[PDB]
């Protein structure tokens, strides 16, 4: 049996989890109340796959999720919403105030207490699983909860389980727009968490998804629902191999092996090709070559970083739907022929290929059109260093005068931790610089 | 759960609190008798933030009413919502301070402070998880200023962890109603900057200007001013009571708005303001809300923000809207007005959004500014203070109640340290 445990910390994590579980329930034909009419309709087969949903004796399927957030409001919206009957009542809510965009509150003082109960529920779930594959945690840099409690949870999970894979999906601060003034402090303080304990961390920028929604989907006024739906599609594309049969199945272990050349460079970018509206779905073939070329466009990247300013270290293409290996090989050859896409000399192969027969599903009331084919490209490249350097600059401009520091140090945190985190992030940058220089 | 204990001191504080409770009861659908007659289910989702549930399905506000003159208390009781309050919370005495801060803080208030603190302790201990206190009063007055400062100091000693807020009405350049306003204002500002976490500065001149120019009211009264202050009060705490795409607590606002401990004085504002008979011409949208937000004439503190720099601002929007639009609008406001924001705090604009607008508006929003220009107010008060302390204009009335020139001198020195602190980040050019 193959399965993963999904964790959602913070408001962004909980909302992304709502989108993800909506998509999963629609994919597997599970009703919001947990009953699957397909069981009585068919009388056989396997529809409620054990990757995400656990079956009970009464025919009710319950997801393998642990929603956590110090704010009662965000999870209370779920507990009284449409999916109130889906999740287990144990929803891990701290009946107190929030981290207040403070890493120290979410890591030292208030982030504790609930941590033991959260680890207890995670332990219960892990005992429930057989052949557990890994953890998929959803958080967001810049938030107090998503920084501090994520640090605590990742640390304790590393101590307890250790060997299991740990995938992170996070919203990195944007170059320009943000909804808090202390985002650089939390983001730079989360570097130890995202570098020591996480085995593979994916980062998405809100401005990139806004531009994608505006240009491709022709949505002039997007909101967080569309961003969460796109992230849900990305995670579904990642995890579709563990569920549905395919010609080339990509397990999480082999997925991680071919995307992390070295231990401390596990920060790949993500992109989704067939992002197109219903009106523009016509007039375009959407063949394999078109989507494969569309993956590498700088315009379609999910993070504000130009790939042409660095080098492509490794790449993994996961196809879904009516895709044949011949077209994938032809597209990869065409991409290798192109010269604007530069690959490091020490990786002659470069590309990993996976194919799945199940095509993508369309959420009701959504924006993505129905497409026979789809692909997700997950690429480890050195351009991400630039995306880290901009934020680094902001931190210095806020740390020269010790602005907003008294709030952090009044919750048990030491002043020098800022400088230590800065030197750490400085290191990761130098390493992404060193790994580029070609050999001689 | 996060619930707030409300305290009202002085005549102005009592009036503003009465209007504020009227606004809150209308928002939550609470009848004047205390029963619930709302329509939406979200009204009772977080009613315990501001109310306590009684036996007969009634709701009593968690208010504490304080004064040294029974007249204001009788005025509140003989009113539309007089019966809503708990009678035991009407703490009052006789022989008010009479516009004398020394009487309010040392002589008369020192006796009623024990009863007020007893009621505060009883109310706070019944909470599940207290969040903080909010106090409404006027600094230029008598019993209000003195007993408010005394209560703030005592509660801060009692409950150091919880957040403290204050909605302070301060003197004005032109609109003067008492002769000893500078003395009370100086001592109140000393106590406030010592022992508070947030302090929203309100001015009668700015509210009158908003009424005359924006709302086109021919005959504004204190009711309209209390209405505006109540709208701001509800906007500040909207996020605790209703769900939103991006929540924001009072603690989060305090963390994001206070760069250094002594800079916790704020300029409030509210949008939209339409004047009636012009709503049909105006198109309501997020750009219009933002444009009215950052206009100089919409501020309630009687400060021109263009005479300084914005240390940090926070916008809380209410109503269904797109996050891309609001983020873009804040970015354009920052970029176009590049010279009015400090260059060492990139993106000094906090954003919060809630999905439950006011009852009669499709969209609304509130603004909290922290800018250097506020220094002007303090400077003005200091000038007037000097103009009376050089000759000891009215000093003896204070010194008869157990005061000394040293206390006034240190209060003035602390205000000068405050204005110097604010002035430090006004001039441009500095650093890498
Ligand atoms: C044509 C129309 O839609 O009617 C509006 C209206 O005409 C205008 C001019 C209203 C009107 O407000 C005023 O005339 C006014 C006068 C002095 C001070 C403040 C307001 C209105 O009275 C105010 C009233 O507002 C509300 O109901 C809000 O929910 C408001 N409620 C109260 O203040 C309130 C009143 C009585 C009892 C309890 C509460 C509110 C705002 C923020 C937070 C909580 C509540 C509304 C819809 C209107 C009228 C009736 C004309 C305005 O008020 C607000 C803040 O809604 C003034 O500019 C705005 C925008 C509106 O267009
Ligand atoms: N894409 C997307 N981002 C979100 C969403 N909700 C919140 N965010 C991001 O989260 C950041 C701050 O909120 P969070 O990180 O979730 O903070 P929190 O989890 O509420 O924890 P506290 O700070 O203690 O309240 C912002 O910069 C947002 O960009 C969402 O629904 N979609
Ligand atoms: N906005 C507003 N201000 C008021 C009101 N009543 C009094 N004030 C202000 O309060 C000041 C007088 O202070 P006062 O309340 O008499 O002090 P107290 O006797 O200690 O309560 C004056 O400058 C008025 O401008 C009111 O109803 N609304
Ligand atoms: Mg939160």
């Amino acid at each position: 049996m193959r399965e993963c445990i999904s964790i959602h910390v913070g408001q962004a994590g909980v909302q992304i989890g709502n989108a993800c579980w909506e998509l999963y329930c629609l994919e597997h034909g599970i009703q919001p109340d947990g009953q699957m009419p397909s069981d009585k309709t068919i009388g056989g087969g396997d529809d409620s796959f054990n990757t995400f949903f656990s079956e009970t004796g009464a025919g009710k399927h319950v997801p393998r999720a642990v929603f956590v957030d110090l704010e009662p409001t965000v999870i209370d919206e779920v507990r009284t919403g449409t999916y109130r009957q889906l999740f287990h009542p144990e929803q891990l809510i701290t009946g107190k105030e929030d981290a207040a965009n403070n890493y120290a509150r979410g890591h030292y003082t208030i982030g504790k207490e609930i941590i033991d109960l959260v680890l207890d529920r995670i332990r219960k779930l892990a005992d429930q699983c057989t052949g557990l594959q890994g953890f998929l945690v959803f958080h967001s840099f810049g938030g107090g909860t998503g920084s501090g409690f994520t640090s605590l949870l990742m640390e304790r999970l590393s101590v307890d389980y250790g060997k299991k894979s740990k995938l992170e999906f996070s919203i990195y601060p944007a170059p320009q727009v943000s909804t808090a003034v202390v985002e650089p402090y939390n983001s730079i303080l989360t570097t130890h968490t995202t570098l020591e304990h996480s085995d593979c961390a994916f980062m998405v920028d809100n401005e990139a998804i806004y531009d994608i929604c505006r240009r491709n989907l022709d949505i002039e006024r997007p909101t967080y629902t569309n961003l969460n739906r796109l992230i849900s599609q990305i995670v579904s594309s990642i995890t579709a191999s563990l569920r549905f049969d395919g010609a080339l199945n990509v397990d999480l272990t082999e997925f991680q092996t071919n995307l992390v050349p070295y231990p401390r460079i596990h920060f790949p970018l993500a992109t989704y090709a067939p992002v197109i509206s219903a009106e523009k779905a016509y007039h375009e073939q959407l063949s394999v070559a078109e989507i494969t070329n569309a993956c590498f466009e700088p315009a379609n990247q999910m993070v504000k970083c130009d790939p042409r300013h660095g080098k492509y270290m490794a790449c993994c293409l996961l196809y879904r739907g009516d895709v044949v290996p011949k077209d994938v090989n032809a597209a990869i050859a065409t991409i290798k022929t192109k010269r604007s896409i530069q690959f490091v000399d020490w990786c002659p192969t470069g590309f990993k290929v996976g194919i799945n027969y199940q095509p993508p599903t369309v959420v009701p009331g959504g924006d993505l059109a129905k497409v026979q084919r789809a692909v997700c490209m997950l690429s480890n490249t050195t351009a991400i260093a630039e995306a880290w350097a901009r934020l680094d600059h902001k931190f210095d401009l806020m740390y020269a005068k010790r602005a907003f520091v008294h709030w952090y140090v009044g919750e048990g945190m030491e002043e020098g931790e800022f400088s230590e985190a800065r030197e750490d992030m400085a290191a990761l940058e130098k390493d992404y610089e060193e790994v580029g220089v070609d050999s001689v | 759960m996060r619930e707030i204990v409300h305290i009202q001191a002085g005549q102005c504080g009592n009036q503003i609190g009465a209007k504020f409770w009227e606004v809150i009861s209308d928002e939550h659908g609470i009848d004047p008798t205390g029963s619930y007659h709302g329509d939406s289910d979200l009204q009772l989702e977080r009613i315990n933030v501001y109310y306590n549930e009684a036996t007969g399905n009634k709701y009593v506000p968690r208010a504490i009413l304080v004064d040294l003159e029974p007249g204001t208390m009788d005025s509140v009781r003989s009113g539309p919502f007089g019966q809503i309050f708990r009678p035991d919370n009407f703490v009052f005495g006789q022989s008010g301070a009479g516009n004398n801060w020394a009487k309010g803080h040392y002589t008369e208030g020192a006796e009623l402070v024990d009863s007020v603190l007893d009621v505060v302790r009883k109310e706070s201990e019944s909470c599940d998880c207290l969040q903080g206190f909010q106090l409404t009063h006027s600094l230029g007055g008598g019993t209000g200023s003195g007993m408010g400062t005394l209560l703030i100091s005592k509660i801060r000693e009692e409950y150091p962890d919880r957040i403290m807020n204050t909605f302070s009405v301060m003197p004005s350049p032109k609109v003067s109603d008492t002769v000893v306003e500078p003395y009370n204002a100086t001592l109140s500002v000393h106590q406030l900057v010592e022992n508070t976490d947030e302090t929203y500065c309100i001015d009668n001149e700015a509210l009158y200007d908003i009424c005359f120019r924006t709302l086109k009211l021919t005959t504004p009264t204190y009711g309209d001013l209390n209405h505006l202050v109540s709208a701001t009060m509800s906007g500040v705490t909207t996020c605790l009571r209703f769900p939103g795409q991006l929540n924001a607590d009072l603690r989060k606002l305090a963390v994001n708005m206070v760069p250094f401990p002594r800079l916790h004085f704020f300029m409030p504002g509210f949008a939209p303001l339409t004047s009636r008979g012009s709503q049909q011409y105006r198109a309501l949208t997020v750009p219009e809300l933002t444009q009215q937000m950052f206009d100089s004439k919409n501020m309630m503190a009687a400060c021109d923000p263009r005479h300084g720099r914005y240390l940090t601002v926070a916008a809380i929007f209410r109503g269904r809207m797109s996050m891309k639009e609001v983020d873009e609008q804040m970015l354009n406001v920052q970029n176009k007005n590049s010279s009015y924001f400090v260059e060492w705090i990139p993106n000094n604009v906090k954003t919060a959004v809630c999905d439950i607008p006011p009852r009669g508006l499709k969209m609304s929003a509130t603004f909290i500014g922290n800018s250097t220009a506020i220094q002007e107010l303090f400077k003005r008060i200091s000038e007037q203070f000097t103009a009376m302390f050089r000759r000891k204009a009215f000093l003896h009335w204070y010194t008869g109640e157990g005061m000394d020139e040293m206390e006034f001198t240190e209060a003035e020195s602390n205000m000068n340290d405050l204005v110097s602190e604010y002035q430090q980040y006004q001039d441009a050019t500095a650093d890498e």
Side-chain angles (χ1 to χ4, degrees):
Chain A
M1 219 162 94
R2 326 137 293 275
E3 54 253 50
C4 313
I5 289 158
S6 147
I7 293 158
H8 304 290
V9 305
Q11 178 156 7
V14 169
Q15 307 254 39
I16 293 156
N18 282 346
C20 281
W21 285 114
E22 181 176 7
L23 180 56
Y24 292 5
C25 284
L26 290 161
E27 255 170 283
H28 288 304
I30 293 155
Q31 298 264 317
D33 57 40
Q35 297 289 314
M36 158 149 57
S38 294
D39 281 329
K40 61 185 184 181
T41 306
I42 293 155
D46 184 20
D47 284 297
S48 156
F49 284 81
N50 313 291
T51 52
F52 288 113
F53 292 91
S54 167
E55 171 185 10
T56 64
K60 188 174 168 63
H61 310 280
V62 61
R64 296 182 167 83
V66 182
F67 287 70
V68 181
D69 170 23
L70 310 174
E71 288 187 83
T73 307
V74 176
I75 286 159
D76 280 352
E77 264 283 70
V78 174
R79 291 212 288 191
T80 66
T82 297
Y83 297 107
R84 61 182 183 281
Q85 229 169 353
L86 183 64
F87 298 107
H88 200 275
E90 192 185 7
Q91 280 282 300
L92 281 304
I93 318 164
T94 311
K96 301 186 180 175
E97 61 267 20
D98 36 46
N101 287 31
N102 197 307
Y103 171 83
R105 289 182 61 77
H107 181 70
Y108 289 113
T109 60
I110 296 283
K112 300 191 171 179
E113 314 181 347
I114 187 161
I115 189 67
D116 217 331
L117 212 176
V118 173
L119 292 163
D120 249 345
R121 196 188 162 184
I122 288 158
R123 146 65 51 182
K124 265 144 171 173
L125 283 167
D127 277 314
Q128 222 170 301
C129 328
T130 297
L132 169 60
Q133 287 257 337
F135 299 88
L136 280 84
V137 315
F138 296 79
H139 69 95
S140 77
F141 299 112
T145 303
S147 62
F149 188 82
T150 310
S151 161
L152 282 174
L153 198 67
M154 291 295 332
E155 161 175 350
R156 298 289 294 279
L157 285 171
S158 155
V159 201
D160 284 284
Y161 297 91
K163 304 283 291 143
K164 303 296 186 188
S165 296
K166 291 163 275 287
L167 305 177
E168 295 195 351
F169 298 86
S170 324
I171 310 196
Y172 208 63
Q176 302 267 43
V177 305
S178 297
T179 70
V181 311
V182 296
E183 276 197 353
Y185 286 11
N186 306 53
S187 302
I188 214 83
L189 291 158
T190 45
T191 189
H192 174 72
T193 306
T194 207
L195 183 145
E196 194 94 335
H197 299 295
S198 72
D199 284 21
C200 190
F202 313 95
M203 332 211 297
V204 303
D205 194 353
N206 280 350
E207 305 192 345
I209 299 158
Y210 287 147
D211 289 349
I212 289 155
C213 284
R214 164 161 81 51
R215 164 161 69 251
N216 289 337
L217 301 203
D218 280 358
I219 311 204
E220 198 70 11
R221 297 187 169 77
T223 178
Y224 286 161
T225 303
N226 310 97
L227 279 50
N228 297 340
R229 276 169 186 169
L230 259 170
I231 290 154
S232 159
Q233 289 289 328
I234 279 299
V235 180
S236 170
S237 202
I238 287 157
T239 63
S241 270
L242 306 173
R243 299 179 286 165
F244 311 99
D245 37 5
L248 287 98
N249 252 293
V250 173
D251 189 17
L252 289 178
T253 302
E254 311 275 20
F255 166 55
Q256 190 212 318
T257 298
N258 304 357
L259 210 65
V260 308
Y262 298 103
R264 298 170 41 97
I265 67 184
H266 59 279
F267 297 71
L269 301 168
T271 180
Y272 201 56
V275 184
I276 197 166
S277 64
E279 310 310 323
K280 305 181 85 202
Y282 312 96
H283 315 282
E284 273 83 11
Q285 300 203 245
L286 307 187
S287 78
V288 173
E290 289 195 40
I291 57 175
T292 309
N293 290 335
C295 297
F296 284 90
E297 225 65 1
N300 287 321
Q301 301 293 351
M302 301 288 260
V303 183
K304 283 286 194 183
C305 59
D306 202 305
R308 297 169 292 182
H309 299 166
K311 287 162 144 47
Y312 273 94
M313 204 155 318
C315 214
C316 177
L317 303 162
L318 309 170
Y319 291 86
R320 296 175 63 167
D322 191 359
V323 175
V324 68
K326 181 131 191 202
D327 306 15
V328 178
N329 290 334
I332 288 184
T334 298
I335 290 286
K336 274 186 184 174
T337 290
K338 280 189 188 179
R339 174 151 300 82
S340 195
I341 293 155
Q342 259 161 280
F343 271 89
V344 295
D345 54 0
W346 52 261
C347 187
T349 296
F351 287 91
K352 174 68 160 153
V353 174
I355 295 161
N356 195 280
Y357 294 135
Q358 182 63 15
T361 68
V362 285
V363 278
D367 324 291
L368 290 162
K370 186 168 89 81
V371 195
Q372 277 146 26
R373 287 170 273 282
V375 85
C376 174
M377 176 184 120
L378 292 203
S379 63
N380 216 351
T381 171
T382 58
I384 194 78
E386 190 36 50
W388 286 328
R390 214 181 271 111
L391 162 88
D392 198 14
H393 183 203
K394 290 181 180 179
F395 171 75
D396 308 350
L397 262 185
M398 204 162 296
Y399 194 71
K401 315 203 154 45
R402 299 301 196 278
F404 305 93
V405 172
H406 69 275
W407 291 111
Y408 289 80
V409 307
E411 301 276 330
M413 171 155 148
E414 186 173 87
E415 182 176 358
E417 285 339 306
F418 290 110
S419 289
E420 185 173 357
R422 179 59 169 79
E423 301 323 319
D424 182 10
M425 195 70 177
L428 184 53
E429 304 178 1
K430 296 311 163 64
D431 295 5
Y432 262 91
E433 275 190 353
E434 261 185 343
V435 170
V437 175
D438 59 352
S439 177
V440 171
Chain B
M1 156 47 37
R2 301 98 77 203
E3 58 211 70
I4 291 157
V5 169
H6 180 71
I7 299 162
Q8 303 168 209
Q11 186 176 333
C12 177
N14 277 319
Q15 295 286 313
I16 294 160
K19 183 58 63 172
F20 160 77
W21 281 119
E22 175 163 3
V23 168
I24 291 282
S25 318
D26 191 338
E27 202 165 68
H28 282 274
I30 294 290
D31 230 2
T33 80
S35 63
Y36 167 78
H37 294 317
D39 48 21
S40 211
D41 321 299
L42 297 167
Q43 287 168 305
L44 296 179
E45 197 92 333
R46 295 284 189 279
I47 197 77
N48 57 336
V49 172
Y50 275 112
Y51 293 90
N52 285 321
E53 171 151 323
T55 301
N57 225 41
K58 300 175 80 177
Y59 300 94
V60 79
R62 196 177 296 99
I64 290 173
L65 304 182
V66 183
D67 184 346
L68 300 172
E69 281 176 20
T72 314
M73 318 312 293
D74 285 298
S75 287
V76 201
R77 263 190 273 212
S78 294
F81 293 84
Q83 318 308 299
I84 202 84
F85 296 104
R86 181 179 297 211
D88 265 31
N89 291 358
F90 283 75
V91 182
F92 60 95
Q94 277 81 13
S95 67
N99 303 127
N100 194 310
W101 186 92
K103 263 183 184 101
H105 193 78
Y106 286 111
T107 305
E108 291 275 40
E111 321 287 20
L112 197 69
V113 71
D114 212 355
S115 296
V116 173
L117 253 49
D118 183 308
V119 176
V120 166
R121 221 172 290 146
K122 192 167 76 188
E123 258 306 340
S124 149
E125 262 216 4
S126 74
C127 295
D128 176 277
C129 170
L130 181 65
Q131 170 68 334
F133 306 84
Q134 60 184 21
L135 189 161
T136 320
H137 75 306
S138 286
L139 317 190
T143 176
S145 161
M147 261 195 68
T149 52
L150 196 73
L151 289 167
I152 288 286
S153 82
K154 296 278 190 176
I155 281 169
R156 202 82 156 103
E157 258 188 32
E158 286 267 18
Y159 302 90
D161 193 328
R162 302 321 148 172
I163 168 158
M164 181 67 65
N165 290 14
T166 311
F167 289 87
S168 289
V169 185
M170 20 186 68
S172 40
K174 327 301 282 297
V175 170
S176 62
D177 293 292
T178 52
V179 176
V180 292
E181 253 169 5
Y183 278 52
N184 303 347
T186 295
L187 307 174
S188 169
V189 166
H190 168 87
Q191 290 292 322
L192 267 154
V193 73
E194 238 300 355
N195 289 359
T196 47
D197 295 337
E198 296 181 358
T199 301
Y200 300 84
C201 298
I202 311 304
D203 197 337
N204 297 163
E205 196 201 7
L207 294 171
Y208 283 148
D209 204 65
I210 290 157
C211 282
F212 282 119
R213 290 236 299 285
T214 309
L215 296 170
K216 302 284 182 176
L217 300 174
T218 57
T219 311
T221 74
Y222 289 123
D224 304 300
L225 317 180
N226 297 329
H227 210 100
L228 291 162
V229 174
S230 305
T232 325
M233 264 155 162
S234 177
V236 164
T237 326
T238 183
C239 261
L240 308 182
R241 297 173 280 156
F242 293 108
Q245 294 168 79
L246 184 70
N247 295 11
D249 200 315
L250 298 177
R251 199 179 293 285
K252 195 185 289 196
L253 295 169
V255 167
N256 285 268
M257 300 265 297
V258 161
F260 303 104
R262 295 170 65 74
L263 310 179
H264 56 253
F265 294 82
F266 302 124
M267 285 187 314
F270 176 81
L273 300 168
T274 286
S275 89
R276 196 144 54 163
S278 67
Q279 72 286 1
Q280 55 262 50
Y281 297 98
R282 164 171 311 300
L284 201 43
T285 182
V286 177
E288 256 65 11
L289 277 181
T290 304
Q291 177 54 288
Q292 187 158 26
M293 213 161 286
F294 282 87
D295 200 335
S296 100
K297 95 196 199 277
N298 204 64
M299 300 317 175
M300 305 191 194
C303 306
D304 200 310
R306 296 168 292 182
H307 293 173
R309 270 156 141 77
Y310 277 111
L311 288 165
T312 166
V313 309
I316 316 197
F317 297 83
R318 303 175 60 180
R320 215 154 293 281
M321 52 175 61
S322 53
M323 289 300 277
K324 190 247 182 158
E325 190 165 54
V326 70
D327 261 308
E328 203 166 70
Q329 286 291 307
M330 295 304 102
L331 182 123
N332 316 345
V333 167
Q334 286 177 211
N335 274 5
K336 289 205 180 359
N337 295 321
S338 71
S339 64
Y340 300 107
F341 297 85
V342 301
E343 321 206 320
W344 51 275
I345 308 180
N347 175 333
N348 56 340
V349 176
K350 181 75 186 72
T351 296
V353 179
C354 179
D355 316 332
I356 309 303
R359 276 211 80 76
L361 302 169
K362 197 149 306 320
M363 284 188 348
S364 79
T366 176
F367 171 87
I368 315 173
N370 189 350
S371 83
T372 66
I374 178 81
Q375 68 177 85
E376 293 194 316
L377 314 204
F378 297 116
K379 196 155 63 181
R380 179 186 326 131
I381 298 299
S382 183
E383 283 184 352
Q384 290 180 323
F385 181 84
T386 303
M388 289 189 273
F389 198 83
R390 194 191 271 131
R391 303 292 300 285
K392 306 163 168 17
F394 298 81
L395 181 51
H396 74 274
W397 292 110
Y398 295 88
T399 64
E401 300 294 330
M403 293 264 277
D404 44 12
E405 291 87 348
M406 179 151 97
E407 177 298 355
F408 283 101
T409 304
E410 61 181 356
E412 196 217 355
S413 100
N414 199 357
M415 210 182 259
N416 284 336
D417 298 12
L418 211 175
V419 77
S420 72
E421 184 154 334
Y422 263 111
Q423 194 300 338
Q424 291 231 272
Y425 320 100
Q426 195 176 279
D427 292 288
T429 84
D431 222 273
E432 149 236 18

